[PDB]
Amino acid sequence: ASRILLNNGAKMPILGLGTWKSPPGQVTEAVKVAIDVGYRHIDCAHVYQNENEVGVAIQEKLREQVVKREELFIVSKLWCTYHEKGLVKGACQKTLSDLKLDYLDLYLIHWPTGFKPGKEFFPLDESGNVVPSDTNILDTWAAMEELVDEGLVKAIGISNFNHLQVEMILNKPGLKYKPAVNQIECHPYLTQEKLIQYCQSKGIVVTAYSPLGSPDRPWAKPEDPSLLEDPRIKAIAAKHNKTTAQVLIRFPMQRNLVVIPKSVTPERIAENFKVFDFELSSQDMTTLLSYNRNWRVCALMSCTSHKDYPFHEEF
Ligand SMILES: NC(=O)c1ccc[n+]([C@@H]2O[C@H](COP(=O)([O-])OP(=O)(O)OC[C@H]3O[C@@H](n4cnc5c(N)ncnc54)[C@H](OP(=O)(O)O)[C@@H]3O)[C@@H](O)[C@H]2O)c1
Ligand SMILES: O=C1NC(=O)[C@@]2(CCOc3ccc(F)cc32)N1
């Protein structure tokens, strides 16, 4: 299937286009191209500083009647400096204005860690530690719930929440809407079997980010694993007459995950969508799972002292 059913009753396209690091001067064409070749899910965030340009593309394709708004699934995320109750609606509204939408299909808390509000996305003390917010994530969740009740967003969810933190929301006193999605890093070097099994057992759909291992990540290092260059993965791809990237995208699809590979290259945007016409065997799947080494692209290194840092816990 091309879409998965969420616990809000809506369907989510299992393949979406990522936009983190997509330059503002290229992301408009990238999203136009994506919609032209079949993508119907775009993953956004205010912290990416490119939602206006994403929005130009979405609006042009609606205006051109290439797609209807109901056929699109647009996702964005509440940044850490907006966890205060009183700031959540404005953050959402800024994102909607930038995207030129009147609702989001899904709005996620981007990280469980709240930071001091202000202009800086990572407010620092004079020794370099990130300055936290005293707002807890249960109160931020209630504010996200209000957005559903005001019609600004059709679904709410979370991102980079560990198992105990997911459980904290599920056990929130007076919980009104369960999270629909937990968006987490997931690829053959970070397979996340425990967290995924937990979320799925609870009816929470998992979205896999950095499925290609984010080769364009700013902190990349030479001695770093490279999925795209792993000859074991190239071999599985060759066996199937597909590219390595296509195998890396198909892999989470077959674990009943949603996946959001990023590209600004038209050829690769198209290539990455051509993943509905082949199947990995169970053996292929177990083989890819065996490459796990708990290697993270996105460790939020600067925030390891925050109380709500999600990656001390095993999963
Ligand atoms: N929730 C969060 O905290 C969080 C964190 C990280 C990421 N995300 C989301 O997940 C998305 C994807 O993750 P990501 O951006 O970290 O990395 P990714 O999708 O794993 O990899 C993107 C990189 O792979 C390249 N690439 C794409 N298709 C390729 C192909 N077919 N062949 C060879 N290279 C290819 C891209 O190049 P070009 O663009 O130059 O083509 C880019 O350098 C993000 O953009 C964002 O939307 C969310
Ligand atoms: O897609 C992403 N979501 C994120 O939180 C991340 C990873 C780690 O932190 C940052 C910081 C700035 C940013 F634009 C992005 C990011 N990338």
Q: How far apart are CA 260 and CA 252, in angstroms?
A: 10
Termini Cα distance of the chain: 29
Structure tokens at 43: 């993953």
Instruction: Specify the resolution in Å.
Output: 1.5
Tokens standing for 180?
A: 């629909």
Q: Which ligand is nearest to the CA of 269?
A: 1
271 CB neighbour count, 10 Å cutoff: 18
Measured CA to CA, the distance from residue 202 to residue 95 in angstroms comes to 29
Closest CA to 245 of 222, 270, 225, 221: 270
Report the alpha-carbon distance of residue 89 to residue 68 in Å, rounded.
Answer: 26
Task: Tell me whether residue 272 is annotated as binding.
Answer: yes
H or E element at residue 314: none
27 in a known ligand binding site: no
Cβ contacts of residue 170 below 8 Å, gap of 6+?
Answer: 178, 179, 202
| Residue of 22, 27, 42, 48 to test ligand 2 pocket, by largest number of atoms within 8 Å of CB | 48
Q: Which of 20, 214, 311 to mutate to test the pocket of ligand 2 (most atoms within 8 A of CB)?
A: 20
C-alpha pair distances (Å), 34 with each of 15, 59, 260, 273, 283: 11, 14, 12, 9, 31
- Amino acid occupying residue 21: K
Closest C-alpha to 16, from 213, 199, 246, 249: 249
- With a 6 Å cutoff on the Cβ, whether 161 touches ligand 1 is no
CB 114 within 8 A of CB 143: no
Q: Is the shortest distance between the CB of 51 and ligand 1 below 6 Å?
A: no
The three-class DSSP label of residue 203 is coil
Is 48 close to ligand 2, i.e. is its CB under 6 Å away? Answer: yes
List, in sequence order, every residue forming a beta bridge with 13; answer none if it has no partner: 3
DSSP 270-286: HHHH--SS----HHHHH
- Find out whether 35 and 62 touch, Cβ atoms under 8 Å: no
Ligand 2 pocket test, candidate residues 21, 44, 47, 158, most atoms within 8 A of CB = 47
Experimental determination approach used: X-ray
Beta-sheet pairing, 3-5 with 11-13? antiparallel
Give the C-alpha separation, 259 to 184, whole Å: 10
Q: Is 112 annotated as a binding residue?
A: no
For 1-315, CATH gives 3.20.20.100
Q: Cα separation of 202 and 212, whole Å? A: 27
Longest dimension (CA), the chain: 54
Question: Do 162 and 170 touch, CB atoms closer than 8 A?
Answer: no
Instruction: Say how far apart CA 225 and CA 35 lie, in whole Å.
Output: 32
Q: 18 in ligand 1 pocket by Cβ < 6 Å?
A: yes
Which residue stretches of the chain are H helix?
24-37, 51-63, 85-99, 137-149, 163-170, 193-201, 231-240, 244-253, 266-273, 282-290
Q: Give the position, in ligand 2's atom list, of the atom nearest the Cα of 160.
A: 5
Nearest to 209 by CA among 31, 71, 40, 19: 19
- CB of 46 closer than 6 angstroms to any ligand 2 atom: no
SS3 assignment, position 310:
coil
| Pocket of ligand 2 contains residue 110 by CB under 6 Å | yes
How far apart are alpha carbons 141 and 179 in whole angstroms? 9
Core vs surface per residue 282-294: b (16+ CB within 10 A) or e: eebbebbeebeee
Take atom 2 of ligand 2 and give the residue whose Cα is closest: 20
Is 138 within 8 Å of 314 (Cβ atoms)? no
Q: How many of the other CB atoms lie within 10 Å of CB of 9?
A: 9
Report residue 247 as tokens. 């195998």
Give the catalytic positions in this structure: 48
Q: Is 115 helix (H, G, I), strand (E, B) or coil?
A: strand
| Nearest ligand 1 atom to alpha carbon 245 | 31
